[PDB]
Amino acid sequence: DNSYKMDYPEMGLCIIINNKNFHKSTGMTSRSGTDVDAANLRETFRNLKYEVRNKNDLTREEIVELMRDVSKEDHSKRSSFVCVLLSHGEEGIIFGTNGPVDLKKITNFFRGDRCRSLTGKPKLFIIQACRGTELDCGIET
Amino acid sequence: HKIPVEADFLYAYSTAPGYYSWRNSKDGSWFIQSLCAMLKQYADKLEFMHILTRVNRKVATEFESFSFDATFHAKKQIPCIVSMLTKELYFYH
């Protein structure tokens, strides 16, 4: 068994959290161009036969609530699970519209022992967000 | 016989630990642009880690920041593939 079994009846869920507008009290800019990302991702995974759910401008609390809810579904007939996070971030952190969420809290819901109908199946997290403030100046070559 | 509770995760980060990630105002983020492009072209031909490697090369070679702010101009980006997967992943049959 060198390859994951991907001929279950369903490819799986693809959850897209698209955070564009943040509360001004967080001091955080609007993420122009992210709607293009979210629509691109929806079409891409649609063509791969994933059941896509797009979500926009979720608070800290809505992200955590969405993530536990989804992890409590019956994924038995699903081959895999995909979550895409589109937001501001820091190292280890994704931003809700009103504040930061530890990435470990989101992914812990899907641990092999906490989401048994995904045990043994690939859990993919795609993260478009900053991880700090360092800049890569590149090298000419 | 058990498996680790952290096994079979993949985290496809847009940028390297500690670094900014870049987004074009009009076209979307470099990473998601490239990820969708590579999935469109290679999901029926390549294993997923090799697709993500193509994404790494696209982001690294075809993008460079354009900014009116000199501090933020001409910068580069490398995505960061973090694999705790235990098998190869093919989206095709």
Binding site: R31, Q128, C130 | S21, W22, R23, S29, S67
Partner: peptide
Amino acid sequence: VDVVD
């Protein structure tokens, strides 16, 4: 222009 996340 490009901007950071």
